[PDB]
């Protein structure tokens, strides 16, 4: 339960965010360590970033949207999470065994979500308990908790949830399902209305420590401190941009 662990000297504050709450379920070398568990096991992204990023588009490509904004529960065949226009599935509860590394969620600012049983109480088993789970269920904040989450699964692929995104309408089958700010293609698809993950705009994702892991081809990116407002609350946060 409570590691009381004797004493520590300096001026103190609270209990904070624990590491044991990280699901290290990683089936490519298991681990000799923890940094070991994540690199020499799973994320083997070497240099294919030019042609991985090839399958993504500028926002200009997509069909202009008519009329009123709706929400899409389709998410189908859209399977390139490193592109800004990935239309993700709304967040469910994902069992701890399918996660390698920490899970980050975005009230646009990033926060860690830890392992827990199906009744919401934190578990500190490094997610190796079977009943451990990552309860990611989301609702768009000013009221819910976050616009979306990104994490890495047991074979090291990045996978994201959030939203659900917006059906801004469109002319043809070459049409956009907006997971971010879009007021280019439709003048009401802002991040607060359609943002479904870290992607602040088509070309800026929220900087966070495992941004280099989950979205690896944004290494070369430039980091900016930007304000944002989410139903009244001020968010100041770094964005990796290009």
């Amino acid at each position, epitope marked *: 339960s409570s590691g009381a662990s004797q004493r520590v000297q300096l001026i103190n504050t609270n209990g904070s965010w624990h590491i044991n709450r990280t699901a290290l379920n990683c089936n490519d070398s298991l681990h000799t360590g923890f940094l070991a568990a994540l690199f020499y096991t799973h994320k083997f992204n070497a240099s294919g970033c030019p042609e991985r990023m090839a399958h993504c588009r500028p926002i200009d490509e997509f069909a202009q949207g008519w009329g009123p904004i709706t929400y899409a529960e389709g998410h189908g065949s859209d399977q390139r999470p490193y592109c800004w226009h990935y239309a993700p599935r709304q967040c469910g509860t994902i069992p701890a065994s399918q996660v390698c590394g920490p899970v980050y969620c975005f009230t646009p600012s990033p926060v860690v979500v830890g392992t827990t049983d199906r009744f919401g*109480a934190p578990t500190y088993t490094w997610g190796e308990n079977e009943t451990d789970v990552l309860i990611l269920n989301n609702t768009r904040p*000013p*009221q819910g908790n976050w616009f979306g989450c990104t994490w890495m699964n047991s074979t090291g692929f990045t996978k994201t949830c959030g939203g659900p995104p917006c059906n801004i309408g469109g002319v043809g089958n070459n049409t956009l399902t907006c997971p971010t700010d879009c007021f280019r293609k439709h003048p009401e698809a802002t991040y607060t209305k359609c943002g479904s993950g870290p992607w602040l705009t088509p070309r800026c994702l929220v900087d966070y420590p495992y941004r280099l892991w989950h979205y690896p081809c944004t290494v070369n990116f430039t980091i900016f401190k930007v304000r944002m407002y989410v139903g009244g*609350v001020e968010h100041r946060l770094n964005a990796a941009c290009n």
Partner: antibody
Amino acid sequence: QVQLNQWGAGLLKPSETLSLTCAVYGDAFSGNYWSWIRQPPGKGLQWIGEINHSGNTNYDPSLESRVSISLDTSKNQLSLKLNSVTAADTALYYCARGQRNCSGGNCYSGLWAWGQGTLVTVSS
Amino acid sequence: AIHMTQSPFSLSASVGDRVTITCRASQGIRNDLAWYQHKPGTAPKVLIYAASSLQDGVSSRFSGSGSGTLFTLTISSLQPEDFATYYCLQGYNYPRTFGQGTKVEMKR
């Protein structure tokens, strides 16, 4: 979409103490508040009380005398307890997660995540 | 204690109508108001918070307006799923106080 979970014994006889718990999924974050609501049969929704990110609470002046709400952050569990219960406390008891933010002057509250209810029949 | 009085307590409407329930505050509650939808068997849903904002994925039919002492929920065209009971609720005062609810039945 986020839905909460309520536990607790629902049948009471008068002068016992009703004691529900409610798994608000998710850690306490700044501005978050949690509250309990009851629907006595045939009546409207009725406010019991709130506890927020700070641990301090508004109750209903009717029930302050004998009610209490805590939040055990260790298990992410909300708690409601009604003392000296009367047969009139029979109702359907809801627990709700919500967010209250102040843009300087004005503020808004709202409850976006809810329990399932627990019917509590108090009757001898 | 800020008393909210909600109008009308009952209301019969067809599918297609505009429906405007309202809710008046004894004193000014700024615009800390909130609108909830209650159907027998289910928990309540927030539809509108801050008296005029739409909760994520609550339909465009639902317009919230007003401020001070006088607030409306307005449904654009009534939909079969919309038939429920609606309660307002202010979040400005020491005792949170509801409206009495408006039960919106279907006409036949």
